[PDB]
């Protein structure tokens, strides 16, 4: 049925907006960022050497991950343990792009996200490369964005502009919107206004 | 005074041995591996992206690290917090080589390890490249080694064979000791004899 991709950089209130959109659409929601983070957690706890992509691959064949498609019940389960809290931690934020860079890690997660998408009917799928790579035949592709200065504001600065330069420059999955994505600049919007706007965009199309 | 370097792979019980060697010599002790692990903790808690070496470099300009040279009182301090327990954790074991591979990071730490070795007098310095890179003019250089099988046996095997395959080899003037069939206290006695005779 109807697939909404929501992509863009972090610190735009992206997740909260995507979930609320889902609810308002009567639809399911999938936090794909959280899946990478669950795998990252499992890798950190296994004490795997992060400079060795082969050890990372080998240690992630059977990641006991379980996530929810309900915007009202988002638990991150790892081996039946609620890891919602640790996966948002600074250590996992540190290690997450190293773990996600591994071709074998992405390949399993891209597959899971796609099965979970079909599995869900009406669904809003949030991430970074949902419109481009994961669900390129999404019906509506939303790209949420804001100035470096507005995201710096919502965070508390110079680290967000470095992560901007790097995410543009990266060799593996650089951040860019899909050719047919609808770019919404949320610098001067509130969250409920961003929701209202995306519902209009979705309802129009 | 007298510098003793103790290098070697992991899983040989090297640390317990160098500490005791230090005690029996009346000497100071420096765990250099811990110093790398303290920096890694800091980087992890700061959430620096481990694939950005320049970010790692800038996040480590002023690491508030303090370690002891007393083999009987090893506490790892990070900004006055005792982190002896976390720096041993798996998260840190996972990230330690990515942080340590950043030249700015090694550069500061090698310098500190040399000043700490300088001001400590008679000292045993544990590491993986002490004899080759950190203290090449060390008086006695020891390199502790053991069969893939012995190291495997201590821990529990597959991840020791890979980590051996994938500076860290003994210095020219390093004395190699294969501990495969020796107990800890025999290793210590052995090293005392090497140190005493030299």
Name the superfamily (CATH) of residues B1-198. Answer: P-loop containing nucleotide triphosphate hydrolases (3.40.50.300)
End-to-end CA distance of chain B: 14
Q: Which two three-digit tokens encode residue B4?
A: 């003793």
* DSSP codes joined into one string, B16-81: HHHHHHHHHHT-EEEEHHHHHHHHHHHHHHHT--TT-HHHHHHHTTT--EE----TT----EETTE
> What is the C-alpha separation between B141 and B139, in angstroms, rounded?
7
- The answer to whether B136 and B168 have CB atoms below 8 angstroms apart is no
Q: Which two three-digit tokens encode residue A21?
A: 């959109």
Looking at the complex, report in whole angstroms how far the Cα of residue B165 sits from the nearest Cα belonging to chain A.
Answer: 12
Q: How many residues does chain B have?
A: 198
Closest CA to A109 of A57, A163, A181: A57
The partner residue sitting opposite B46, judged by closest CB among A44, A90, A98, is: A90
Indicate yes or no: CB of A93 within 8 angstroms of CB of B45.
no
Residue of B39, B51, B56, B86 to mutate, interface with A, max A Cβ within 10 Å? B51
Q: Which pairing describes strands A123-126 and B175-178: parallel, antiparallel, or unpaired? A: unpaired
Per-position b or e across B134-163, b if 16+ CB within 10 A of its CB: bbeebebbbbbbbebebbbeeeeeebbeeb
- The answer to whether A180 and A39 have CB atoms below 8 angstroms apart is no
- The answer to whether B16 and B126 have CB atoms below 8 angstroms apart is no
> What is the C-alpha separation between B22 and B5, in angstroms, rounded?
11
DSSP β-bridge partners for residue B66: B77
User: Residue holding tokens 């970074």?
Assistant: A128
Looking at the complex, report in whole angstroms how far the Cα of residue A51 sits from the nearest Cα belonging to chain B.
Answer: 6
CATH 3.90.1150.10 assigned to domain A1-205? The reply is: no
Looking at the complex, report in whole angstroms how far the Cα of residue B109 sits from the nearest Cα belonging to chain A.
Answer: 20
> What is the C-alpha separation between A23 and B82, in angstroms, rounded?
46
- The answer to whether B36 and B142 have CB atoms below 8 angstroms apart is no
| Residue spans of alpha helices (H) in A47-89 | 53-58
* DSSP codes joined into one string, A171-185: SSS-----TT-EEEE
């Amino acid at each position: 049925s109807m697939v909404v991709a929501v992509d863009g950089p972090s610190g735009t209130g992206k997740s909260s907006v995507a979930k609320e959109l889902a609810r308002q659409l009567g639809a399911s929601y999938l936090d794909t960022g959280a899946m990478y983070r669950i795998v990252t957690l499992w890798v950190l706890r296994a004490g795997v050497d992060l400079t060795d992509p082969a050890a990372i691959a080998a240690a992630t064949d059977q990641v006991p991950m379980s996530v929810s498609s309900d915007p009202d019940a988002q638990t991150a389960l790892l081996a039946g343990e609620d890891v919602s809290v640790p996966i948002r931690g600074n250590e996992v934020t540190g290690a997450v792009s190293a773990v996600s860079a591994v071709p074998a890690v992405r390949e399993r997660l891209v597959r899971q996200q796609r099965e979970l998408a079909e599995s869900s009917g009406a669904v809003v799928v949030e991430g970074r490369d949902i419109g481009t790579v994961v669900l390129p035949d999404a019906d509506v592709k939303i790209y949420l964005t804001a100035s470096a200065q507005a995201r710096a504001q919502r965070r508390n600065l110079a680290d967000v502009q470095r992560r901007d330069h790097l995410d543009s420059t990266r060799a593996v999955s650089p951040l860019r919107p899909a050719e047919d994505a609808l770019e919404v600049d949320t610098s001067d919007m509130t969250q409920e206004q961003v929701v209202a706007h995306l519902l209009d965009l979705v309802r129009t199309r």
